[model samples]
Target: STLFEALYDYEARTEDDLSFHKGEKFQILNSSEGDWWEVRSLTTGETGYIPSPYLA
Candidate 1:
């Protein structure tokens, strides 16, 4: 859930970017597709794609 927490905290800058904000929340829709993770802004509801590295 580390990646989930990271994405939830900030907006992913790039597919390889692995940084997060402070107040964000994301969800994992598909975990079977390699490192494909779906994330969303808890406040704005903005969703996007993030890599698996962000989780680590």
Candidate 2:
């Protein structure tokens, strides 16, 4: 539930190069590699990668 909690608490950032709006819900999908998790916004369905550090 660590990843779930992080996503629920809005702890993940959309890559430093990009900007993310608040109050967005992202879904956790598959990972590319170590500690990297794939996520997609529930509202926009935009997908990206995130690190484990972003999670609880």
Candidate 3:
């Protein structure tokens, strides 16, 4: 991941905002958000959601 970007950075129509910020680093936690990948925030040691498209 690495919000240092994920995972934007999407929401096809209705989805939770990953709220990814540049330099925001994230580690893959797992498939925790349906389509969004479960990631661990490096900056804030917390699990959150983000898509692979943005993460990639």
Worst 10 residues of 1 by lDDT: 1-10
Best by TM-score: 3
Q: Tell me how many clashing residue pairs each candidate has.
A: 5, 0, 8
Which lDDT value does model 1 have at 24?
52
lDDT tens digits, residue span 1-56, model 3 = 33445433333333343455656677776754556676677777766566655645
Query: Using Cα atoms with residue i matched to residue i, what is each candidate's TM-score against the true structure?
Result: 0.48, 0.50, 0.54
Cα deviation of 36, candidate 3, in Å: 1.4
Please provide, for model 1 over 1-56, each residue's C-alpha lDDT reduced to its tens digit, 9 standing for 90 to 100: 22245435544477443345764555655556666665554555556666756664
- Kindly indicate the candidate among 2 and 3 with the higher TM-score: 3
Best by lDDT: 3
TM-score of 3: 0.54
Whole-model Cα lDDT of every candidate shown, in order: 0.54, 0.53, 0.56
From the highest TM-score down, the ranking of the candidates is: 3, 2, 1
Residue ranges of candidate 3 with Cα displaced over 4 Å:
1-17, 31-34
lDDT string, candidate 2, 1-56, tens digits: 12243333444354631124555666667755667766666666566766646652
